[PDB]
Amino acid sequence: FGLTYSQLMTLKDAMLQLDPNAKTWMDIEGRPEDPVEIALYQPSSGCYIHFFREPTDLKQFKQDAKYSHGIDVTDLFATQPGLTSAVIDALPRNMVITCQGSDDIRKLLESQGRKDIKLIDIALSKTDSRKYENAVWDQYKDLCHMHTGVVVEKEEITPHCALMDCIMFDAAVSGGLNTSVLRAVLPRDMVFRPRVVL
């Protein structure tokens, strides 16, 4: 399934930092059956899961990049295969996950056999959900560098990040953005994999 026992032990220990009962956001970039960026966020603790995956459909990816995420495909080369399945399978049983537009999130969780996970859809408008878009990027821009491509709507807009979306959707529901220290759940060497002769 991708991961050695040593890595599985590290992952399951890291995911115990998630409070099984706390408010948990989840957003993805890319199609549900072919995701390229996955993020979970718990505002109560400041814990976040954030990782990437290589697209199977390159033609769909390049098209999605111009209208949504703006991820350069070259930057996804060092990603760990099987991370998506391993993280989702390690999520607490009957966990309650909140997000904007639950349809794609549901299809991804169901494709991983996690029908037990309950989903709350906030179902806000694009304007209401992204009221604190500027404020989130102003505070947390250093947490993701992957969105370098120009994203259009014809008007240039801020690229869609799975992690930034989780934070800004929370700020919209709470009616404000808190100054809080964020903590990465996954080790950096687990997200990304490189020598020397050939």
Add this chain to the structure above:
RNA sequence: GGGC
């Protein structure tokens, strides 16, 4: 319209 919502998601990408």
Add this chain to the structure above:
RNA sequence: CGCCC
């Protein structure tokens, strides 16, 4: 309106 619900 590129795709998708």
